[PDB]
Structure 1
Amino acid sequence: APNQALLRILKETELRKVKVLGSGAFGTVYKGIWIPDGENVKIPVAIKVLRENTSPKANKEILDEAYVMAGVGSPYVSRLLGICLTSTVQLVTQLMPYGCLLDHVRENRGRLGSQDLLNWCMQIAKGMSYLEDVRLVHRDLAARNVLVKSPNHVKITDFGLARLLDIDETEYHAGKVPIKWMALESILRRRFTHQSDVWSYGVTVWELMTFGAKPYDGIPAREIPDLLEKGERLPQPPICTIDVYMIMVKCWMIDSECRPRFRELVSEFSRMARDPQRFVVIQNED
């Protein structure tokens, strides 16, 4: 397919940093205003500024992510609006007014419904399904890396650890990593596949269904491998029916072939979203 994605290379003076939004992976994200050259409009943006010390490998990876994320793809992935190539690379994207899903669920704990949670799980799966189709392994999928455009619309973002797989490459061999969201084979053998993304997807869904609890809270990160090989997993969130929790459990099978495919997670969460109260018992949050 002719990939007519437009990539904008912006001068730094088109951007104004207005507020610090938080940290992404390997970079600081700012709220700002992009005034595109030749235009008088003030567009609300997020601007992620990466480390200043970047190796060739890193620059190549940044440009891969940019090659994929510039496309008009899924509505459930954040689109790269443009890059500013100063000494330090700045990545520019549409500002999502409701911030990251992790904060959103924590601070809307009392008001979020079954339908919301299930829609988000579906949309994240749809986003990841799409990334799978474009050969991108995220390696860092987590509630902190999903954004809320609006209550009914989430987007996978950041992509700080994302790797584009070449033709007939099926694993990335890996640098600091999110241990508590990682598949066992990723922790132990630094192998990253779309199937180890499914594991991270399961922890994301756990995060949402617990309203942003910390996975394995108080458990040191060094004990996580051992814990997982001894068959422990994250416990059933109070609001999950066994239906929903079983899918999570399936994401955390030690054999990566026994984990769901993202297209199956799409269909399973779409089915459940149709009758949300049957699969998420929201009253159990009390």
Structure 2
Amino acid sequence: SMDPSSPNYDKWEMERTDITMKHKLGGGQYGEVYEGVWKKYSLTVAVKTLKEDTMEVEEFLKEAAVMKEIKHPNLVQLLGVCTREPPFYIITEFMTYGNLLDYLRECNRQEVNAVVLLYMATQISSAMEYLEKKNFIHRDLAARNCLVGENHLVKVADFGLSRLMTGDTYTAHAGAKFPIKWTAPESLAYNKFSIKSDVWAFGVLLWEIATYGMSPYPGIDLSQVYELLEKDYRMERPEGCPEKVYELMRACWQWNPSDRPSFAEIHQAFETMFQ
């Protein structure tokens, strides 16, 4: 009786009218993403849009397709889509405190203390263990792509920031575009990626967390990063970072991807870090 019956049924397709669109999120730097309220469930959501036929549709539908397969407590959750006609919507759960990078930079450090930092990292570890299980390469793992919810809930996401972020975050190396300071050496030289290149990115993220959102490789110019890494230069241990978290960072930044731990081994590392 209540079970679906009609030929064009799609369990992900939602009633546009159920959603009231509020204002743009992330002051423009995160693309066409808005706060919304799913009316009947007294639920605030995030709604990524595509105004009309810009021919950006294929890129948008593919993101939708990806998010439908992804289900984990520390990965952004798809709630529904409006993809039968424009304006196209991707509706996800709303994460109150926005991206992790700005969160860390603006937080009260007595509340977001060293224990909370370690716990946030553990949540990211678990999310990447799951992606590794699904054999999904993130490609742009970083605090700017992590989201923070209530009670220090952290979720890995991807805003497609390489086409949105102005400045010296994403630039050219050997003629290809990278977030240079989060990119594994082999990815810079060969423009290829793997689960182990996300492992390198996770070590940088660890350093971002430990420093409350400092920019990696302080002061070092972008075009200096690769040659520095090749000589075995690695970022120093942040102030107040326990040794075993720092050795995990250093394990993620092994020159050879074969020597980097798996995300499964990274999460075990957090589990056994005491005694």
**Distance change >3 Å, CA 223–CA 11, structure 1 → 2:** farther
Q: Per chain length, whose mean CA-contact separation is higher, i.e. which structure has more relative contact order (CA < 8 Å, sep 6+)?
A: 1
In the alignment, what sits opposite 1:78?
76
CA contact (8 A) 2:101 2:143 kept: yes
Distance in 2, matches of 1:266 and 1:41, equals 35
**1:6-85 correspondence runs (5 A):** 8-22=12-26, 27-35=31-39, 40-49=40-49, 53-54=54-55, 59=58, 62-71=60-69, 73-85=71-83
Q: CA deviation at 1:235?
A: 1.7
Q: After superposition, what is the alpha-carbon deviation per residue over 1:54-103, rounded to whole angstroms, capped at 9, x for unaligned?
A: 468xx2x6545433422462201111112222446432101011222222
Q: For residues 25-76 of structure 1, what are the alpha-carbon distances to aligned partners after superposition, in whole Å with 9 as ceiling and x for unaligned?
A: 87332212234xxxx33421112235974468xx2x6545433422462201
Aligned-pair CA distance for 1:145: 1.3
**CA contact 1:25–1:158 (8 Å) conserved in 2:** no
Segments of structure 2 that go 5 or more residues without pairing to the other structure are: 1-9, 162-175
TM-score (norm 2): 0.80
2:26 is paired with a residue of what secondary structure? strand
* Kept in 1: contact 2:196–2:257 (CA 8 A): yes
Q: 2:169 — aligned with what?
A: none
- Between 90-99 and 8-17, report the one with greater CA deviation: 8-17
Offset at residue 244 of structure 1 (A): 1.0
* CA RMSD, 1 decimal: 2.9
* Percent of aligned pairs sharing the same letter: 40
The residue number in structure 2 matching 1:167 is: none
What are the superposed Cα offsets for residues 106-129 of structure 1, whole Å, 9 maximum, x if unpaired?
222522222211111111010011
SS class of match (1:151): helix
Structure number with bigger Rg: 2
1:155 aligns with 2:155: yes
- If the length of structure 1 is used for normalisation, what is the TM-score? 0.77
**Cα distance in 2, alignment partners of residues 80 and 216 from structure 1:** 34
Q: In the alignment, is the contact (CA less than 8 A) between 1:132 and 1:194 conserved in 2? A: yes
Partner of 2:138: 138
- Contact 2:81 / 2:91 at 8 angstroms: preserved in 1? yes
Structure 1's 178 and 106: CA in aligned 2 closer, same or farther, altered over 3 A?
same
Q: What's the counterpart of residue 239 of structure 1?
A: 240
Task: Give runs of ≥4 in structure 1 deviating > 6 Å.
Answer: 23-26
Q: Deviations over 1:121-148 (max 9, x none)?
A: 1110100111111221111111111111
